[PDB]
């Protein structure tokens, strides 16, 4: 009924924090995002997760980091958390130099490809635009 | 067990929509996710925690913009769960 969270370690929590983007992307700088990665750092620290902040990665650096974390052994760990703080579009996260599909980042942690994580919760937290609609709200 | 099982995607915003961020305090969703994890990670199951985040962003935030088309705008995060069990942090 509930996942075994009694493993030797809570697990890995990766924070990818992107604030400044190449001129080629046209993406504005993300003021306020240092606060986000520092609020997430202390929050997941106190939850007994191993927090690694990475700053301003290109999109090949994003795919590299993810394949390397997928290749570590998490067998003494309960869960895996990945926090993506970027610009994005629907199905897409931006490196500093351009876009990459979200599914390419998460297919690295699939059960048949990250076996020390099979049967365990993999949690992707994604602060990123997914398009360009705006919500005008309602009266209540 | 399917290869897609046991994946939980907590998106900051609904599909198709911008995500909003405050220049001093951070993104509306990350501000809310930590504040709810702080107060609730020892009590509630993860889905119920994320549901409090959803309520927090939907209720407490509205955009302030010098731009007519960007002013008075709202947001709701989007929980996508392929989890097969309940998730507790204790």
């Amino acid at each position: 009924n509930s996942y075994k969270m009694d493993y030797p370690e809570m697990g890995l929590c990766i924070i990818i924090n992107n604030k400044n983007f190449h001129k080629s992307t046209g993406m504005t700088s993300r003021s306020g995002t240092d606060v986000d990665a520092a609020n997430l750092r202390e929050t997941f620290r106190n939850l007994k997760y191993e927090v690694r902040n990475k700053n301003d990665l290109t999109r090949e650096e994003i795919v590299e980091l993810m394949r390397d974390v997928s290749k570590e052994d998490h067998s003494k760990r309960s869960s895996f958390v990945c926090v993506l703080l970027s610009h994005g579009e629907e199905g897409i996260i931006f490196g500093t130099n351009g876009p990459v599909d979200l599914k390419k980042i998460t297919n690295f942690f699939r059960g048949d490809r990250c076996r020390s994580l099979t049967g365990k919760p993999k949690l992707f937290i994604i602060q990123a635009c997914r398009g360009t609609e705006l919500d005008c709200g309602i009266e209540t | 067990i399917p290869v897609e099982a046991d994946f939980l995607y907590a998106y900051s915003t609904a599909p198709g929509y911008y995500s909003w961020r405050n220049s001093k305090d951070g993104s509306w969703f990350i501000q809310s996710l930590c504040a709810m994890l702080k107060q609730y990670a020892d009590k509630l199951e993860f889905m119920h925690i994320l549901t409090r985040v959803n309520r927090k962003v939907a209720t407490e935030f509205e955009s302030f913009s010098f731009d007519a088309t960007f002013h008075a705008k709202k947001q709701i995060p989007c929980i996508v769960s392929m989890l097969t069990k309940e998730l507790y942090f204790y």
């Binding site: 046209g26 993406m27 306020g32 602060q127 360009t132 | 909003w20 961020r21 405050n22 302030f64």
Partner: peptide, 7 residues
């Protein structure tokens, strides 16, 4: 208050 491109 910022957004995370312009359509």
């Amino acid at each position: 208050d910022e957004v995370x491109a312009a359509a």
